[PDB]
RNA sequence: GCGAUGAUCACCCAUGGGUGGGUACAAAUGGCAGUCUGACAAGU
């Protein structure tokens, strides 16, 4: 008789006495939980299913639910006679393999737990048979994949990756700033008036890439970088400049630096666009409401998206200016009312006391939208709740604006 | 839907809403999702009542986390407009918090409802 | 400034410094898994809180034989967000392994995060009533501990131990009358559950009430023997 | 100056200095005993 | 005689190396979110970035992959086989191809930055031999540059007296003797 | 003198400090430890010292009960008067936070009651024979 | 086979280790450190 067992690396089959129940009785009664009995009955047929994590997860999901094509290609040649009896643990798998095409007899979760227990006990002794390794870390990997599938982690919904993105973005802003300042200074030995007249880091570096020395600039155009007046201005300064003459080794290395500057700027805008796309994927309603950037700032400030959901509305209203918050609470002045939301589009659209009121109502509506997007076990990702909350808050904003103050 | 899991039947809803109005009258009740979360944070809540037909359900569904984290009983009731009547305000309310105060006349009621809520949990 | 002394259980320690502490070792240095304060003396140590882990409270109350030795395999039922199974995996260390089981999804995600951090802990988000279902993955944990809040604690422990536990194994259960009966005296309840386990072939050895750190809470330790 | 003697305020660095502290406490003692 | 180039080049070498550190750590972090035991196996961060740039996704692993990542530095420490099985059976969560392109672009960015550092360091060496060759041949180009940066200018260094340059048992003897000879060299190279 | 917002802030600081102190401290255990033994003769002969293979102190004090085989605080200055003194200062510090917190809670409660009474109502002032002042507001739905 | 182009000038165990202090860089779910109010308002 055959017995089937499931291993993290493969599917195993062992042949034994057809009187399997009586064999189990002998096992448990004589304490045959040892290498003696398992060398008596080592293996019948093994199959190590391929090392593809998707194949692993799907095959085990099928083990949980139904019968696999791997199972078919294993059970193609179990039998010698038309009738063979196979031990299986799962009852649903038992009746499924009853209904399958070969139609050999099978037995469900009988007293054969003795067999399963002992063959797992000296499965380490079975490892020299087919799987010459330690299955522990195999099981770790498979379990993590299975848990991922069971919880249904969409590859896009990872708040921690969002915090990574925003922190990296801030750091990129700081370091691009310091590099641009350094390059402006180092080129200052050659064209200080330009350093003063233009302020854009990218514009400066592209200038260094296009022109190299002042009259070369006088003869070269800069239309696609700067407008006409600014490029003629740098023309005049090039005529009357106070910098030295530069060797081409120096010029080469300063040019390489400016190239690094523009490549960083291109990367930074690219990564910001990435962050836009990813947040639209994750929490679309909040993005629809307040805006992708301030949504990122909100999630970052709270840490977890879930904890940000847990926070009440007022904390979302004043999530940023906590320093002034607590200082004013302690010193009995009046608390701040904007915090981090102040950079939201609608609160920017409002004016003064209208800014305060729209801030409050936007805080509450955003709290609602945030909770829905975070805890929606299923979610359309369209952002329809965001659109409706936005419509409501816009009506509120128009009402406040049309609410005049002076008696006409 | 099992997301709003503990949903009171008619009788338990009656006694819940009655003690809710009592507490609204003696002013031991905080009305609204946000203020309820605030009481929950401060640990001053005797228990939590929620609506079950909110549009949608998650906006208050956030609460059971903090509730059963801090061991504060919570229960759902069928209609938010009914809950608004029970609270005694002009607008439908979706979630209210019965606070805790030793110097309350409704002590024994709140404790009976909280008893039955815990049994149901 | 802090003296470290070994507790009677291999893997746990007591710190005698400005304050006393009950502590374990660490495998993720400089990373507290749920906010508890760590110390170093150097080698990294991490404190338990008895109020937050029933195992911690039981150890603090004193136990004769806790069957989690470092070089072992330990199964955990009811790893609610994993705050305690982190400490258990710390006790076990790299030599052994810990198989945790959870059902409700949010603690499932938390425990997936923690099990991504640590390799000794392994996640089973599958339902605990169906060892038939999650029989794929883990093989015969050496000792079994349960914190499940469900009324059929003995039933589910019986299934798990029958299907998986090594014979002469150790089993530890956390039990609370406020959830099982909640209207009848706690010691009577504990008599009822110990009778259930003796029926289900678990020979009890000890049980402790944890009343300084948790009201109406018992922990029972017994041996699994004469079984297959 | 130092890294650990860097205090965020002139008052607290005045505290950190020690000779000042003993002179101040002394002087305050005798001025109080003359007041009393 | 201009040397503000030397000052700036030192500012760059230092800050740039710090930033190389930071961004290599970031790439370690992200490709650990995808596949962490590689980040544990290979600590050399530049090789880590190039290895990511090669194996974008952990799925791609064959024997030709084995050989090519063996050409990536070597096999002598079993890196090839160890990463192969670790990635075949990794517990690494999978993420979007957008994330893969992001991480690969970032690793490319760091690699270019490091190559820039090498170029700049050779620049500094030859510029020193241009400007202050005697001081360089005495102490070493990098350290001489650090001296000049501390002083503020070659002129400030040379104008500086011997003991102040020093602050700028036989260990003390040799240190002070070196300071004297260094100051003399700075004078010669400045004037 | 002070404002309700400041009082609320101070009380919440004290709550967080108190929970931190409780996290860092512990309490001595006192459980109802019950042993299961098989035969009546073994129970009659049972002694905790042998069943736990400990000594007198090791069995009287609970948390860490060693075996004699395993057996097979003077490092600090003035161990017998300084370390225990620090122990008690930590304990009384926790208790001081506790009682200042409860005083602040009482003050905040009184301030809130006064503020609400000024806030609204169709109020009636009722005095209870324990001398205590309450206000019963008439039953009116608030619009 | 010298020198102004520079001579000379905190603890413990026996030139070995431990304790401390100084400078740079990095990490922290370390600390400081607590997340506003809660029902009316706008027109007639």
PDB file of C-alpha atoms (C1' of nucleotides) in Angstrom, chain A residues 301 314-315 317 322 326 330 335 403, chain G residues 33-38 41-43:
ATOM      1  CA  UNK A 301       4.804  61.956   9.943  1.00  0.00           C
ATOM      2  CA  UNK A 314      -7.813  67.249  15.082  1.00  0.00           C
ATOM      3  CA  UNK A 315      -4.397  65.599  15.105  1.00  0.00           C
ATOM      4  CA  UNK A 317      -5.492  69.167  11.250  1.00  0.00           C
ATOM      5  CA  UNK A 322       3.382  70.256  17.016  1.00  0.00           C
ATOM      6  CA  UNK A 326       2.607  72.242  22.715  1.00  0.00           C
ATOM      7  CA  UNK A 330       1.824  75.232  27.912  1.00  0.00           C
ATOM      8  CA  UNK A 335      -2.789  77.012  19.416  1.00  0.00           C
ATOM      9  CA  UNK A 403     -20.243  84.611   2.566  1.00  0.00           C
TER      10      UNK A 403
ATOM     11  C1'   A G  33       7.968  64.576  24.175  1.00  0.00           C
ATOM     12  C1'   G G  34       2.270  65.777  25.826  1.00  0.00           C
ATOM     13  C1'   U G  35      -1.016  65.285  19.867  1.00  0.00           C
ATOM     14  C1'   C G  36      -6.574  71.596  19.870  1.00  0.00           C
ATOM     15  C1'   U G  37     -11.683  72.905  21.096  1.00  0.00           C
ATOM     16  C1'   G G  38     -16.988  69.788  20.273  1.00  0.00           C
ATOM     17  C1'   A G  41     -23.488  79.100  12.426  1.00  0.00           C
ATOM     18  C1'   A G  42     -25.263  81.674   7.577  1.00  0.00           C
ATOM     19  C1'   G G  43     -29.725  84.221   5.391  1.00  0.00           C
TER      20        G G  43
END
